[PDB]
Structure formats: structure tokens, C-alpha cells
């Protein structure tokens, strides 16, 4: 996260860290959507251009965390994975279309002050909130700048959804209806973005109707970190909700 700020304790209790077991390496963000299910980006797990293909035994998640490196006793929870599910039409060859994966925990996680699931959007919430100019919140422990510099506390930034034609014009990559983009205009004075390592984490919005937080997006891809006129791209969670449900309903 660039130009974010430190999260308050318990501010994002669905935040999940995805780690490589050996060597210990923070890979990606993720989010808790039930006591057994974690949502992330497909490219965090499977990316053939980098000869990346993690199985359940390669990985672990950390839930309830605030500090990046510090062990938080009786609060953070480490879970192993029973199974990984990648969207069967995830497109790594071209444009990261359908950049979504589900991970089933080996054992359900106990909810607490610091561990609590986010909602998935229904059609009315999607209709209400996913509009150009409306802001969501992105969180993560990823880099603070371009990869070629790490926060100690979970970072938070609020970013406006960008009009689809402007998203399209920002990139030569073919965008799809399974993505949306978010970020400020050049010379707005305001800035902010997700960076390397924030991938797979949640873009959330709070409904004025029922006061619940909903995960509308997954940090997916972007041309640079906080570069002028380069908004971040997010997996459109509502558009892929039928797949999410089929997996949980079938394998839950």
C-alpha cells in the first residue's frame, strides 16, 4: 500500500496473510469469508510466467494480525489449508481475467474481536455501491513502493472507483467485465494504490443500508505503484459470485 495509513486494531478483522511455509515468505493478502473459507487472487497461487504453482502443503495463512513481523499471542491464528480452488477460467496468458481463488482451512477458525468474516455482495448491494466515484477500502502489508520499504503495521487506503472508459484508456491490456479499477485522478492532490504483496487482499465498501462491510474487489493487477493515471485493477467479486457459491456449497 502506497500513501496509506496504519490500521486501527480490529479495523479489518477479515484480513488474512498468505505465507509460503519454507522459506517463510509473505506472498499475498486474502480475506476471511466464513470460519473455513478464505478468498484470494488466483495469481498468488498459480502464475506460470514465474513458474509459480503453490499447492496446499506449500502454504499457510495468518489471521487476526496487526503487526507484520511480530507474534501476537492469544490473538493471531495460524491455519493450514485443506484444499485450493482456482477459477477454471483464470486467464494468466493475457490479462488476469477471473483472478480469483478459494482456500479451505483444515480446521474452522474461532471468531474473536480480531477475527471476523466480511460479507459477499448481493445484487442490490452491488447495484448500490459499485459506482464510479464511490470509495472502497484496500488493506495490506505489501510494498510501499515499486519492487525494483515494508510496513510494520497493516496499511489502509480509501480509493474511488474509476469510470470503465477511463480504466480502458489507462492500459493497452484488454480489460473485461470481471474487473474494475480504482484510484485518484492525476493532480487531485490525493494519491494511493495497492502494490506488490497486497495482491489477493480485499477491496471493501460499507453499506449505509445495514452498516455491514462487503468485499467488492480483490487486489489483482496494475501498471506500477501509485503512478500518475495508472489506477489499480480489482477482480469484480459480484460478477464471480456464482462460482464462489458453487465451490462453498459443493466442497464446504
Amino acid at each position: 500500500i502506497v500513501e496509506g495509513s496504519d490500521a486501527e486494531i480490529g479495523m479489518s478483522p477479515w484480513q488474512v496473510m498468505l505465507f509460503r511455509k519454507s522459506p517463510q515468505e509473505l506472498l499475498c493478502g486474502a480475506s476471511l469469508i466464513s470460519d473455513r473459507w478464505v478468498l484470494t487472487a488466483a495469481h498468488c497461487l498459480l502464475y506460470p510466467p514465474w513458474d509459480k504453482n503453490f499447492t496446499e502443503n506449500d502454504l499457510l495463512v495468518r489471521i487476526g494480525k496487526h503487526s507484520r513481523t511480530r507474534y501476537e499471542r492469544n490473538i493471531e491464528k495460524i491455519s493450514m489449508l485443506e484444499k485450493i480452488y482456482i477459477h477454471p477460467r483464470y486467464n494468466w496468458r493475457e490479462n488476469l481475467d477471473r483472478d480469483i481463488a478459494l482456500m479451505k482451512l483444515k480446521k474452522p477458525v474461532a471468531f474473536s474481536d480480531y477475527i471476523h468474516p466480511v460479507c459477499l455482495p448481493d445484487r442490490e448491494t452491488a447495484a448500490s455501491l459499485l459506482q464510479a466515484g464511490y470509495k472502497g477500502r484496500v488493506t495490506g502489508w505489501g510494498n510501499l513502493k515499486e519492487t525494483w520499504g515494508q510496513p510494520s503495521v497493516l496499511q489502509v487506503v480509501n480509493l474511488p472507483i474509476v469510470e470503465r472508459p477511463v480504466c480502458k484508456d489507462s492500459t493497452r491490456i484488454r480489460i473485461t467485465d470481471n474487473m474494475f479499477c480504482a484510484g485518484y485522478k492525476p493532480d487531485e492532490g490525493k494519491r494511493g494504490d495497492a502494490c506488490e504483496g497486497d495482491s489477493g487482499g480485499p477491496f471493501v465498501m460499507k453499506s449505509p443500508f445495514n452498516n455491514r462491510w462487503y468485499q467488492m474487489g480483490i487486489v489483482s493487477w496494475g501498471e506500477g505503484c501509485d503512478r500518475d493515471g495508472k489506477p489499480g485493477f480489482y477482480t469484480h467479486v459480484f460478477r464471480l459470485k456464482k462460482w464462489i457459491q458453487k465451490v462453498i456449497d459443493q466442497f464446504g
Binding site: G10, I33, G133, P208, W213
Partner: protein, 31 residues
């Protein structure tokens, strides 16, 4: 799933975090 998206230390306590108003403002305009 029934209790989703309501944070123990915020919504459940009728407390607001420091920047959530910025989101509400964007959905309506200003204030």
C-alpha cells in the same frame, strides 16, 4: 455468514473508525 461484515470493535460497539466517513461521503457527496 449471518454476522458478516459487522466488526466486534466498531459496529458492534457503535464506534466508527477514523476514515469510514470518507466512504459514506463519497456515496452521497460531501459532509
Amino acid at each position: 455468514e449471518a454476522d458478516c461484515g459487522l466488526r466486534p470493535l466498531f459496529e458492534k460497539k457503535s464506534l466508527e473508525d477514523k476514515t469510514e466517513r470518507e466512504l459514506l461521503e463519497s456515496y452521497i457527496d460531501g459532509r
